[PDB]
Design a protein around this ligand. Structure first.
Ligand SMILES: [Mg+2]
Ligand SMILES: [Mg+2]
Ligand SMILES: [Mg+2]
Ligand SMILES: [Mg+2]
Ligand SMILES: [Mg+2]
Ligand SMILES: [Mg+2]
Ligand SMILES: [Mg+2]
Ligand SMILES: [Mg+2]
Ligand SMILES: [Mg+2]
Ligand SMILES: [Mg+2]
Ligand SMILES: [Mg+2]
Ligand SMILES: [Mg+2]
Ligand SMILES: [Mg+2]
Ligand SMILES: [Mg+2]
Ligand SMILES: [Mg+2]
Ligand SMILES: [Mg+2]
Ligand SMILES: [Mg+2]
Ligand SMILES: [Mg+2]
Ligand SMILES: [Mg+2]
Ligand SMILES: [Mg+2]
Ligand SMILES: [Mg+2]
Ligand SMILES: [Mg+2]
Ligand SMILES: [Mg+2]
Ligand SMILES: [Mg+2]
Ligand SMILES: [Mg+2]
Ligand SMILES: [Mg+2]
Ligand SMILES: [Mg+2]
Ligand SMILES: [Mg+2]
Ligand SMILES: [Mg+2]
Ligand SMILES: [Mg+2]
Ligand SMILES: [Mg+2]
Ligand SMILES: [Mg+2]
Ligand SMILES: [Mg+2]
Ligand SMILES: [Mg+2]
Ligand SMILES: [Mg+2]
Ligand SMILES: [Mg+2]
Ligand SMILES: [Mg+2]
Ligand SMILES: [Mg+2]
Ligand SMILES: [Mg+2]
Ligand SMILES: [Mg+2]
Ligand SMILES: [Mg+2]
Ligand SMILES: [Mg+2]
Ligand SMILES: [Mg+2]
Ligand SMILES: [Mg+2]
Ligand SMILES: [Mg+2]
Ligand SMILES: [Mg+2]
Lengths: 197, 191, 106, 172, 136
RNA sequence: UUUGCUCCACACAAUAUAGAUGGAUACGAAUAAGGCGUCCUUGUGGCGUCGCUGAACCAUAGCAGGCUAGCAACGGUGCACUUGGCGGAAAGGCCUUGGGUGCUUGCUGGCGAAUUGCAAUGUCAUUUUGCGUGGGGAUAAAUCAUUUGUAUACGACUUAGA
RNA sequence: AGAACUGGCGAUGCGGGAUGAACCGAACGUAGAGUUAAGGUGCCGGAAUACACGCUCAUCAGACACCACAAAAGGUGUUAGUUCAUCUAGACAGCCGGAACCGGCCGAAUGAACUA
RNA sequence: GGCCAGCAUCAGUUUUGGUGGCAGGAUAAAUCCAUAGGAAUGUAGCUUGCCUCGGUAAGUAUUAUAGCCUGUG
């Protein structure tokens, strides 16, 4: 449909967001994910802490390098769940995975771009209420992700400028709605009304 | 089996005004001000008459209804906390070595400070929770007193001190020393 | 004006396949705005063109086109099946494609 | 198994020269078609009188339509069933609009709570519960209070497109 | 200093709660909740829109804020009287919800010519508005 | 080492391309709650309203958009310029002052369109390089060899030399 | 390790059981359109993030015949049952009076053993 | 007539819809109509005891200032 789709990660279930993002790529849609830190995982924090440590303990024994690589940062945790749903050892796979970017936070392109939500990955809609769950950044930071606080500081600084933006917008789009307000009742209006507008 | 409706009643007294928006709860009494975040629960708080607030769980399961009352109680103790108050008295007991208990503060701190426990040269320090005021009880021996509007904040700062005094490497039912919670009740007496 | 498009946007998804083996003679097409199998029936028999560029000029242009038709529908999400003058290269899986409004029955 | 109709199934042993006009026994069978239903009749009739489908004959098969399909009824349901250890009887209460509607939601329950498939259940009796406070079970009586209302909090709305540009709302 | 608790005030499954079908052979019609079966099923009757008296899952139905007076278990005709009596349809129609269902069905009936007439009008409406937009 | 380099302008050569073809259209937060409007004593406030999907919004007419004329507006919109402010997360982009050049489908006109013959994408994106003209700009090094021993199997390392 | 009958493998590819001689499905000239079996339809991956009723929260959840093993035994987790019995002859609890029994307070169900 | 398309009219195979007329059954069951009966998750009326012109609590009352259930036809 669109050239690039920005997905606010906040409030989404990793594996369900992963599965849709995996498929967008394979069908050619470029995807960029933001706020991977505030991604969710079903299940209470401790289990998810344990699970990662199980991941953590697997490595090629004679050389720890060639064995599995354990990434900490929420994006790479999420890129991993996403890579795991793609054919990535093929060329078509590498191809699909280039169409994807994942970021913790919202870096400078995309902070003034528009970010979407995938309801079938959305935690609020998906989980039975009162089922314990996990914010991804908090997990990442307990397995060694060092940047949780920077992202927070930047996001809060950023979240302030976005309200300045939204403030002026809500004010100007109050003027606009006082403009259509008088053009209502007009000859042109009540005709557009007739056809559905 | 999913009870379709169940509720409880927070009865609201005179000098008290409680304000609940989403699941943040604020109780304003003449004694003080207390706020508690219930967003982990999933209930509907409903005002009826300003003397009474109802809290209900719709279509609830066994464990879910169970959480209803412990919501009510939590608020009740918030109201009774902001009016009557909470006074926890606890008395040091020592079979031989007298337990030297004090409030020292460095870096604007205010801790309880316990010396010579079982002749321990080590000095125990339990920090003073904000909202609890300590006083050592006059006229009664080896009594210390913790007072505030938060049961939670108080009774922790009680067991705080009470557990710094655990004894190691002896039969505990012989060596009974420590500082144990003597009594728990409210700040304004006759109530 | 701005928009000259007389086709409907589409995607080259996969060949016809089982999990084990495929059939390059048949492709599966996703058509924008088509949702349901019954949504898909409209575009049956319509004509697809996969447009692509090349290095050599041929007839006087560096653009070439493979041409095919929409033969039948696929599953419950309104993906559609299509067969082409020659089989699409499969390097094209996830490439855009064009479903024209003719042959028309409107 | 499947979705049910109720059949009157009437049969008699084959007439013998000395015994013409045998005694015509009938059952009310909940099945999904008459071929299953008539098997059941022979399934049970073998467990009551001495007959096989060989020695017997089916006199009539007549579908039985609910007599007030829009009136909400309470139903006592008496069931015999097999667990993994032994066989035992039961009583449950189903609130629904017909008999055939309830036998369904019974077979679901016996499957869902007790892991009891179709073959392991006999339906002993289904009866309307004619008067309230003859309803013994709380999961029904809960619905019988005067002037019942209740909400449906935390409402979800299936998406028709994978991406979405608002953040949803569970309200109602 | 009154207490000021919030509300979180839901639409209610209740007898006399007019309800909009979503999926079904009746899809898109108003009915009323006649009786109540369990936490999922209810009985409905729609007669003024011609929906049959039937039991139905609440998941095929979306509760409206409109509701009228009606006895539990009330038979079809009685639903007809009280429905019209309280002007259910009249009140659904005035609603911005129903008006948006209206509005979107008209945009479906539009014809290429009509669609073009729409656009010409829009550029006309835009001109007058953006004019107003720079005066204040 | 024949006139080599680089930024800006344009010409054509070619070479590719995981796949332009109206527009990636910006609060944050909650979800057993919120968005917007408005009012006050500015609150966990009052009141009004909306939701039940973007099926929206914006844009969209004119030789792929030719040549022209008029009115009405004082608006929209593009290009180069200029005023000042802001953005370091990957800011490399957002906002604004001012004069200058263009479009307008807000409305009314004149001219053109065929014969590409009933369809044959019937050609409008962007990537890198090279070859040539003025318009700016810039005039180093590294390696071998020699040398050193804080280094070293050899390579490498670390010193030194107009 | 050794008999019975039959169907198989061996001598046989093909679809399915991720993998696999023997399982399921189906037995093979070369191709085409259609429909299917067994098995499947979050994504890898063709195909409903399909509809519907329950059950399940695990600081070792679980997830499919052949099949890739766990048992006796416990739980006041939580579900639905069974047989007995108290309950508007205000029971069951926490106070309080009389001497466990009955009441003063209570305003609705509760106790016992068992099934899975 | 060399290869190729496109359309039309057909033929063989097939897939996806739309619409017409009939046959069954409890000659569907229901809704609806007429009628008799009856009950409470008891509507009007009445009485009653509190509680503020604002209704509340429990007795009485079977269609009344709602309705329902059940048989009959
Ligand atoms: Mg992991
Ligand atoms: Mg290690
Ligand atoms: Mg390497
Ligand atoms: Mg490390
Ligand atoms: Mg210890
Ligand atoms: Mg010991
Ligand atoms: Mg010892
Ligand atoms: Mg061929
Ligand atoms: Mg697809
Ligand atoms: Mg019957
Ligand atoms: Mg019986
Ligand atoms: Mg049995
Ligand atoms: Mg959002
Ligand atoms: Mg705000
Ligand atoms: Mg509001
Ligand atoms: Mg305001
Ligand atoms: Mg405000
Ligand atoms: Mg406000
Ligand atoms: Mg840079
Ligand atoms: Mg050297
Ligand atoms: Mg053997
Ligand atoms: Mg051999
Ligand atoms: Mg053989
Ligand atoms: Mg053989
Ligand atoms: Mg074989
Ligand atoms: Mg195979
Ligand atoms: Mg296996
Ligand atoms: Mg195999
Ligand atoms: Mg499988
Ligand atoms: Mg797919
Ligand atoms: Mg389901
Ligand atoms: Mg299986
Ligand atoms: Mg199993
Ligand atoms: Mg197994
Ligand atoms: Mg056991
Ligand atoms: Mg056992
Ligand atoms: Mg036991
Ligand atoms: Mg047990
Ligand atoms: Mg148990
Ligand atoms: Mg058990
Ligand atoms: Mg020929
Ligand atoms: Mg027709
Ligand atoms: Mg017909
Ligand atoms: Mg007929
Ligand atoms: Mg008849
Ligand atoms: Mg008929």
């Amino acid at each position: 449909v669109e050239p690039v789709v920005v997905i606010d990660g906040k409030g989404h279930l990793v594996g369900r967001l992963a599965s849709v993002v995996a498929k967008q790529l394979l069908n050619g849609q470029k995807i960029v994910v933001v706020r991977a830190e505030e991604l969710n995982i079903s299940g209470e924090f401790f289990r998810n802490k344990l699970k990662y440590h199980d991941f953590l303990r697997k490595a090629t024994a004679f050389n720890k390098t060639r064995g599995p690589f354990h990434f900490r940062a929420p994006s790479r945790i999420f890129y991993k769940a996403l890579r795991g749903m793609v054919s990535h050892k093929t060329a078509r796979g590498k191809a699909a995975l280039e169409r994807l970017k994942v970021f913790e936070g919202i870096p400078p392109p995309y902070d003034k771009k528009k970010r979407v939500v995938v309801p079938q990955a959305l935690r609020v809609l998906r989980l039975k209420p009162g089922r314990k769950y996990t914010t991804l950044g908090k997990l990442s930071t307990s397995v060694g992700w060092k940047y949780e606080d920077v992202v927070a500081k930047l996001e809060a600084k950023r979240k302030v400028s976005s309200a300045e933006y939204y403030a002026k917008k809500r004010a100007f789009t109050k003027k606009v709605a006082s403009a259509n307000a008088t053009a209502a009742e007009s000859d042109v209006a009540k005709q557009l009304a007739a056809l559905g507008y | 089996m999913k009870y379709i409706q169940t509720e409880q009643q927070i009865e609201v007294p005179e000098g008290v005004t409680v304000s609940i928006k989403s699941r943040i709860v604020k109780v304003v009494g003449p004694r003080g001000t207390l706020t508690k975040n219930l967003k982990h629960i999933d209930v509907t708080f409903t005002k009826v008459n300003n003397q009474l607030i109802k809290v209900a769980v719709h279509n609830g399961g066994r464990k879910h209804v169970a959480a209803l009352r412990t919501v009510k109680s939590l608020v009740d103790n918030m109201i009774t906390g902001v009016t009557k108050g909470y006074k926890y008295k606890m008395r040091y007991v020592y079979a031989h070595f007298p337990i030297n208990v004090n409030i020292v503060e460095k870096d604007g701190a205010k801790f309880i400070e316990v010396r010579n426990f079982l002749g321990d040269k080590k000095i125990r320090n339990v920090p003073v929770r904000d909202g609890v005021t300590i006083e050592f009880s006059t006229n009664v021996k080896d009594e210390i007193v913790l007072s505030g509007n938060s049961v939670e904040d108080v009774s922790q700062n009680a067991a705080d001190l009470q557990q710094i005094c655990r004894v190691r490497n002896k039969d505990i039912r012989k060596f009974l020393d420590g500082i144990y919670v003597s009594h728990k009740g409210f700040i304004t007496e006759d109530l | 004006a701005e928009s000259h498009r007389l086709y409907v946007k589409g995607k080259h998804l996969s060949y016809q396949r089982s999990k084990r083996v495929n059939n390059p003679n048949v492709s599966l097409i996703k058509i924008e705005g088509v949702a349901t199998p019954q949504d898909a029936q409209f575009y049956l028999g319509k004509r697809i063109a996969y447009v692509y560029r090349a290095s050599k000029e041929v007839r006087g242009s560096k653009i070439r086109v493979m041409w095919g038709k929409v033969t039948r529908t696929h599953g419950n999400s309104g993906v559609v099946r299509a067969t082409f003058r020659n089989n699409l290269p499969a390097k094209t899986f996830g490439a855009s494609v064009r479903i024209f409004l003719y042959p028309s029955n409107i | 198994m499947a979705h049910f109709k109720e059949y009157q199934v009437i049969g008699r042993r084959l007439p013998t020269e000395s015994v013409p006009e045998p005694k015509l026994f009938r059952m009310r069978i909940f099945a999904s078609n008459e071929v299953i239903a008539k098997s059941r009749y022979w399934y049970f009739l073998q467990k009551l009188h001495k007959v096989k489908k060989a020695s017997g004959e089916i006199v009539s098969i007549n579908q039985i339509n609910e007599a007030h399909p829009t009136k909400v009824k309470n139903f006592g349901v008496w069931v015999r069933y097999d667990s993994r250890s032994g066989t035992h009887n039961m009583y449950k209460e189903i609130r629904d609009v017909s008999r055939v509607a309830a036998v369904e939601t019974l077979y679901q329950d016996m499957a869902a709570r007790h892991r009891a498939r179709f073959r392991s259940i006999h339906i002993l009796k289904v009866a309307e519960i004619e008067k309230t406070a003859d309803v013994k079970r709380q999961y029904v009586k809960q619905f019988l209070t005067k002037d019942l209302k209740f909400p449906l909090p935390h409402r979800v709305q299936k998406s028709t497109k994978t991406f979405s540009y608002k953040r949803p709302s569970t309200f109602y | 200093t009154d207490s000021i608790v919030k509300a979180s005030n839901w639409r209610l499954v209740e007898v006399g709660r007019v309800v909009l079908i979503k999926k079904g052979q009746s899809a898109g019609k108003l009915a009323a909740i006649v009786e109540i079966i369990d936490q999922k099923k209810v009985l409905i009757d729609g007669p003024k829109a011609g929906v049959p008296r039937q039991a139905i899952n609440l998941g095929q139905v979306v509760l409206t804020p409109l509701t009228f007076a009606l006895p539990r278990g009330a038979r079809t005709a009685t639903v007809s009287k009280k429905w019209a009596a309280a002007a259910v349809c009249e009140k659904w129609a005035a609603s911005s919800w129903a008006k948006k269902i209206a509005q979107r069905e008209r945009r479906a009936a539009l014809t290429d010519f009509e669609r073009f007439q729409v656009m010409v009008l829009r550029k006309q409406k835009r001109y007058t508005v953006k004019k107003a937009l720079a005066k204040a």
